[PDB]
Amino acid sequence: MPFEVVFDGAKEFADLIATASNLIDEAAFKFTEEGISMRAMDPSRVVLIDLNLPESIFSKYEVEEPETIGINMDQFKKILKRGKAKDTLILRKGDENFLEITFEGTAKRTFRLPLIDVEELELELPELPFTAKVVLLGEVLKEGIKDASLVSDAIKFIAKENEFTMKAEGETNEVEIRLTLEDEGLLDLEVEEETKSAYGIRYLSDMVKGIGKADEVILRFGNEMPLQMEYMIRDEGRLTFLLAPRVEE
Amino acid sequence: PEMKAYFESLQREIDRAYAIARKARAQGKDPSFDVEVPQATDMAGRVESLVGPPGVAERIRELVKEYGKEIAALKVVDEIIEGKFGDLGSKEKYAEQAVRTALAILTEGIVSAPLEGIADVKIKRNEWADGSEYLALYYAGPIRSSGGTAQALSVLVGDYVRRKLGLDRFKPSDEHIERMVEEVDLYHRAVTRLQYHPEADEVRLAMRNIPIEITGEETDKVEVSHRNVPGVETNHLRGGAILVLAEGVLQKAKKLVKYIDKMGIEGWDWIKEFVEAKEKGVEKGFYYELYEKFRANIAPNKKYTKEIIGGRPLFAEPSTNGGFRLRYGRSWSVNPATMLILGCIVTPATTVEGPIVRLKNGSVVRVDDYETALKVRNEVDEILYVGDALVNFGDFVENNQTLLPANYVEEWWVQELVQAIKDLYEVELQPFAENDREAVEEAAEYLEVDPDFLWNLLKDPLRVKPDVETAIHLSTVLDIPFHPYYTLYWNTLQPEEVEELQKALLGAQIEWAEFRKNRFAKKVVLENDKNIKRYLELLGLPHRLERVEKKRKVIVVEYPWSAALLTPLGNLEWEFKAKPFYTVIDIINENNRIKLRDRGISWIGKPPVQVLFPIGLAGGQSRDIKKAAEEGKTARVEIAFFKCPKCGHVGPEHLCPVCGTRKELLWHCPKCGADYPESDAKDFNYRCPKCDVELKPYAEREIKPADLLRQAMDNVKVYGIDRLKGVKGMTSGYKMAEPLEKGLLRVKNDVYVFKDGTIRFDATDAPITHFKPKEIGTSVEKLRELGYTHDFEGKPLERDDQILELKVQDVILPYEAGRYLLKVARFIDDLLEKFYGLPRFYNAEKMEDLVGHLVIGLAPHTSAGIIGRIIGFSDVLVGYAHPYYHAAKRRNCDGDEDAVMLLLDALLNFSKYYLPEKRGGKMDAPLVVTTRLDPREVDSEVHNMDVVRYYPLEFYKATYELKSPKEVKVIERVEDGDMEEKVARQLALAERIRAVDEHHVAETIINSHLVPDLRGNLRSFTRQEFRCVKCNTKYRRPPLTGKCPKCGGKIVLTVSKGAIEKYLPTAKMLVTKYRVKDYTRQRICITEKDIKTLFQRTLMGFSADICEKMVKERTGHS
Ligand SMILES: [Zn+2]
Ligand SMILES: [Zn+2]
Ligand SMILES: [Zn+2]
Structure with missing residues (x-):
């Protein structure tokens, strides 16, 4: 159960805590020898969060016995709120059920917080082909979602062979975001067949609020298949989100 | 003479307060010339407080003391009926004064039934049945706060009344009985859920057996089917008839036979048959037999049923008896270390020990004081041991209550010690006190112990307790059982876990030590992988967990817990075996050198009024008088x-x-x-010569506060006022106005007033026995200045940490009453300095300066208030009382909270003209004050001295025969929340979830709150109340009208869709956090109903959705 891990930087992980806190409210990061992971769903049934952080992201990584602890998103979010990326993030847990967050930067800040007993049911995710996998940047997703969410609440995703488009309609205000490979915002296209689906942009707003500007974002979804969006962290970590499609109009 | 001199000092202070009350009252600024409120010497003065008669006090003092109130009451009834107090008039008046007076004598003026309970007394005729006369009692509105016993006793008095006057028994007809049964059912189904629901046969027969009839006016606006009933005046629901009929007699049937049998009245065999109808219910260890007798008892199973229906159903452990530890005391005490962590009155105390607590890291440590709880409170997982509690022997529990066997305490063990050395080494040692140097010296010579340790042991056995080696050394010689402090609760689980446990201990690393031929282990090193330590956790054994040695769980039991652990096993010499009808301790004591005793075999447990000025709706929305006087709004109300x-x-x-x-x-x-x-008016005898009507003092007219408020500010010369409000209507009889200057000082003094004109602060008290100055924080010099001279030991009061007894007129109020009543004292001082022109009497500037003054305590449905004296302050919001200050008779009427007022405040602000005429709350008015409470200086003053931890042996040895708390002979043979409570439910419920081992059973605790949400959402759902913006009290019809025809505002509807959506995730997260049946339909039906009403296909059921997961189970199984 006692373990210690030292990760360099505080702001890069604070973006993950920010995205998670804005997409989930109660989660318990499970700690394995391969790294820190978390497979949970928002308690309002809006998104599905799957955090995969290997030990390669962490500078120091010391485990005695793998176990699972619960971390509040709010409190831990407020800790790394003003935490500078030039600090040294230190996670330490000993015999007692306390969490020690030592910062070795301009001022050593050894922290301590209790760890509640979360009863999170470890649920997995099945595998099936989506036939629509796109590789796009993050900033294009930012400006593409924040502008269309004001004119409508649902956005339609359509991907064809070497063609990508995201059109959303409404009462008297239409919009579309069409990108191809020869553009400057779409990296890669792995679309094999015609794909079209509808989703809620209101989930996509807070879902993309924590994304970066140069982070490669990969989306996987289908026609009647759910929405999947995963992106890497420091080229090794992977964060995957899956939300159910909209069965309404 | 000390308490007598203190009573003389109190009398001098009351004389001074009366002198100031006459010099200030003589000014005429109050609706009185002299002091309206008198003082009472004894119960005789308190009886005359209700109806009188003015002069029966001599007969009360001369007959109650001699013959008893049962006979003296009948003697007074005989004096009233025979006409010894004066010619009253018709028989209804003599019968009325006899019932009210006799009721005041039997109840000792504790209840207000002759005042606010009984409306009238009228003799009628049974013309519809035979034509004979009978007695009819008319009850008023407030009747529930009078207790069910006295309400029955009054009828018995009627049985005498008609016996003396010559009336006849009442004959209920069929329509009367069926109408009363209808009133019980309707009153029981909707108005108030009673405890025992009566049956038609016993209401019919029992009602037929009642001599006189009882009824009342309309109390609850509940129409009945049986209308225009002969002999009944109203066609509504009479709450008084049901509470006196059902809850009065049927509830107290097991005592009413004792009153009838005590007075000597014949004709009550029906209640006796009713009591009789309630009586239709080699290889064997001794401890096992005692448990069989404990299970055979009907009192713990029936009370356990009432607590299991009156709370959480099927959540407590059936094996471990939850509740406080049964600690008898002489006629509650709870460690406050567990109050804030997690029925009866929870009395706080810091003298007894505390229970043990399991930490979060795996260790278990005990919490004896409140400081430890503040330290380990952040790692508490569950509360195995609740705490301790003192249960008085004269605990009034009727309906065949048995006395459960007493726990094996450390005091009776001291008695076992002094009798062991007394019977073996003939050393005379008096326990529960300090002995001479000779007896303790020789006892220390024979027992090889420390005389000082024996002094502190006999001095305080709870504080000072021997270690394990002295206890083993003294058990194998005196043939006495082991020490109770180091005695585990071995009778808590099957012996198989013990049989496997000793085998798990055979392989453990156990080291032994020898001290005075005592072979006792020092520590035990055992792993949890071989056997679970759940039984060890149930034993309450402090241990430590360690997993840093690459091992799973290596727990170690160190000294002195190791020796106390291997002592019942006989140091692993004899092998324990699971035997039928033999418990663990029985088999241990079967073959062992040290005996054992089962310790735990028992477990138990607004209104914002500032001035009596009727303003009505003229004040706007908050009835502000300043706004009406400023704007110019008039009040067309009834005033004089x-x-x-x-x-x-x-x-x-x-x-x-x-x-x-x-x-x-x-x-x-x-x-x-x-x-x-x-x-x-008094010349014409308040009769108008022209009109032959009664001149009423008040009348309906207009009121202009602009010209009235201005004429009062210049009197006391005040200008700084914030906001003043009055009442909607004067509820008194005369409806007399209150001087506005009083309110002009109340708005600046930050105080409030009630309808009775007295500033009564509601507080909560508790009876105590003894305490120390350290717990209250009072110096020795202060106690010396209070009047204390010596303790109960006769030693002068010089030691600070010394047990001191409490006097009669002593109260300890919290900080809230000190500052508030301090502001009230400043209101009286300010009232005397400018409005009356008299010098100040309180002269209190600080909270501690209030010590020495006099207060008055008034109880609900009481016409007298007991004068007290503040002596200290407590941090807890509740106060402390004294059994003499707060008698045991007044506690049985379900009265806990009391109204606290000041002496001079009532002497200068109370007026009799402010009495209500039809309505009334729990208390009417402080009509009579009481100060003389001499506690039998010649008789009981000596009995009160020896009450400090008087635990005899006859109780502990005689308790194994399943006696009753009512059998006082065993003692006389030796005597001769939505914020705190909501979180408390969220934590205790989780503790119950941890207690049931993830085995949840359907229950109704939160459902008790979910049903009104269901019927409220469905009920208000089809209502759709339309309220426009401008008009609020003008509701629109449920059909749609488009817009409000009166005002040009949109109509707002209340379908209850957005207000209830806040309480739903509260329990929805808890219900969603577990898969249980029979309740999923109620949880998902309402939210799916909201979905269907308002109108995201979820990929799967990961939010704990039992819908898809469950149906998938059934479908895949088919
Ligand atoms: Zn005048
Ligand atoms: Zn007239
Ligand atoms: Zn309107």
Whole structure:
């Protein structure tokens, strides 16, 4: 159960805590020898969060016995709120059920917080082909979602062979975001067949609020298949989100 | 003479307060000339407080003391009926004064039934049945706060009344009985859920057996089917008839036979048969037999049923008896270390020990004081041991209550010690006190112990307790059982876990030590992988967990817990075996050198009023008087005015603002339109010569506060006022106005007032026995200045940490009453300095300066208030009382909270003219004060001295025969929340979830709150109340109208869709956090109903959705 891990930087992980806190409210990061992971769903049934952080992201990584602890998103979010990326993030847990967050930067800040007993049911995710996998940047997703969410609440995703488009309609205000490979915002296209689906942009707003500007974002979804969006962290970590499609109009 | 001299000092202080009350009252600024409230010497003065008669106090003192109140009451009834107090009139008056007076004598003036309970007493005739006369009792509104016993006893009095007058028994007809049964059912189904629901046969027969009839006016606006019933005046629901009928007699049937059998009245065999109808219910260890007797008892199973229906159903462990540890005391005490962590009154105390607590890291440590709980409170997982509690022997529990066996305490063990050395080494040692140096010296010589340790042991056995080696050394010689402190609860689980446990201990690393031939282990090193340590956790054994040695769980039991652990096993010499009808301790004591005793075999457990000024709706929305006087709003209400004969001023003021002469009352004739001063009204005997009607003091007219409020600010010369509000209507009989200057000082003194004109602060107290100055924080010099001279040991009061007894007129109020009543004292001082012109009497500037003054305590449905004296302050919001200050008779009427007021405040602000005429709360008015409470200086003053931890052996040895708490002979043989409570439910419920081992069973605790949400959402759902913006009290019809025809505002509807959506995730997250059946339909039906009403296909059921997961189970199984 006692373990210690030292990760360099505080702001890069604070973006993950920010995205998670804005997409989930109660989660318990499970700690394995391969790294820190978390497979949970928002308690309002809006998104599905799957955090995969290997030990390669962490500078120091010391485990005695793998176990699972619960971390509040709010409190831990407020800790790394003003935490500078030039600090040294230190996670330490000993015999007692306390969490020690030592910062070795301009001022050593050894922290301590209790760890509640979360009863999170470890649920997995099945595998099936989506036939629509796109590789796009993050900033294009930012400006593409924040502008269309004001004119409508649902956005339609359509991907064809070497063609990508995201059109959303409404009462008297239409919009579309069409990108191809020869553009400057779409990296890669792995679309094999015609794909079209509808989703809620209101989930996509807070879902993309924590994304970066140069982070490669990969989306996987289908026609009647759910929405999947995963992106890497420091080229090794992977964060995957899956939300159910909209069965309404 | 000490308590007598203190009573003399109290009498001098009351004489001074009466002198100031007369010098200030003589001014005429109050509706009284002299002091209206008298003092009572004893119960005789308190009986006359209700109805009198004025002069029966001598007969009470001469007959109650001699013959007893049962016979003296009948003697007084005989004196009233025979006409010894004066000619009253018809038989209804003599019968009324006899019932009210006799009721005041039997109840000792504790209840207010002759005042607010019984409306009238009328003799009627049974013309519809035979034509004979009978007695009819008319009850008023407030009847529930009077207790069910006395309500029955009154009827018995009627049985005597008709016996002395010559009336006849009442004959209920069929329509009367069926109507009363209908009133019980309707009153029981909707108004108030009673405890015992009566049956038609016993109401019919029992009602037929009742001699006189009882009824009342309309109490609850509940229409009945049986209308226009002969002999019944109203066609509504009478709450008094049901509470006196059902809850009065049927509830107290097991005591009413004792009253009837005690007085000597014949004709009550039906209640006796009713009591009799309630009686239709080699290889064997001794401890096992005692448990069989404990299970065979009906009292713990029935009370366990009442607590299991009156709370959480099927959540507590059936094996471990939850509740406090049964600690008897002499006629509650709870460690406050567990109050804030997690029925009866929870009395706080810091003298007893605390329970043990399991930490979060795996260790288990005990919490004896409140400081440890503040330290380990952040790692508490569950609360195995609740705590301790003192249960008085004279605990009034009727309906065949048995006395459960007493726990094996450390005091009876001291008694076992002094009798062991007394029977073996003939050493005379008196326990529960300090002995001479000779007896303790030789006892220390034979027992090889420390005399000082024996002094502190005999001094305080709970504080000072021996270690394990002295206990083993003293058990194998005196043939005495082991020490109770180091005695585990071995009778808590099957012996298989013990049989496997000793085998798990055979392989453990156990080291032994030898001290005075005592072979006792020092530590045990054992792993949890071989056997679970759940039984060890149930034993309450402090241990430590360690997993840093690459091992799973290596727990170690160190000294002195190791020796105390291997002591019952006989140091692993004899092998324990699971035997039928033999418990663990029985088999241990079967073959062992040290005996054992089962310790735990028992477990138990607004209104914002500032002035009596009727403003009505003229104050706007908050009835602000300042806004009405400022704007100019008039109040067309019923009020009275006064008249000044000399000057000519007319106003609600008592004293003439212009002149210096006192004005009198004004009487307006209701029929005519003339006003008659008080002087002219009393001349015509308050009768108008023209109209033959009664001159009413008040009348409906207009009120202009702009010209009234201004005439009062210049009197006391005040200008800083914030906001003042009055009442909607005067509930008193005369409806007399209150001087506004009092409110002008209340708005600046930050105090509030009630309808009775007294500033009564509601508080909660508790009876105590003894305490120390350290717990209250009082110096020795202060206690010496209070009047304390010596303790119960006769030693002078010099030691600070010394047990001191409490006197009669002593109260310890919290900080809230100190600052508030301090502000009230400043209101009286400010009231005396400018409004009365008299010097200040309190002269209190700080909270501690209030010590020494006198207070008055008034209880609900009481006409007398016991004068007290503040002696200290407590941090807890509740106060402390004394059994003499707060008697045991007044506690049985379900009265816990009391109203606290000041002496001079009531002496200068209370007026009898403010009595209500039809309505009334739990208490009416402080009509009589009581100060003389001499506690039998010749008789009981000595009995009170020896009460400090008087635990005899006859109780502990005689308790194994399943006695009753009512059998006082065993003692006489030796005597001769939505914020705190909601979180408390969220934590205790989780503790119950941890207690049931993830095995949840359907229950109704939160569902008790979910049903009103279901019927409220479905009920208000089809209502759709339309309320426009401008008009609020103008509701629109449920059909749609488009817009409000009266006002040009949109109509707002209340379908209850957005207000209830806040309480749903509260329990929805808890219900969603577990898969249980029979409740999923209620949880998902309402939210799916909201979905269907308002109108995201979820990929899968990961939010704990039992819908897809469950149906998938059934479908895949088919
Ligand atoms: Zn005058
Ligand atoms: Zn008249
Ligand atoms: Zn309107």
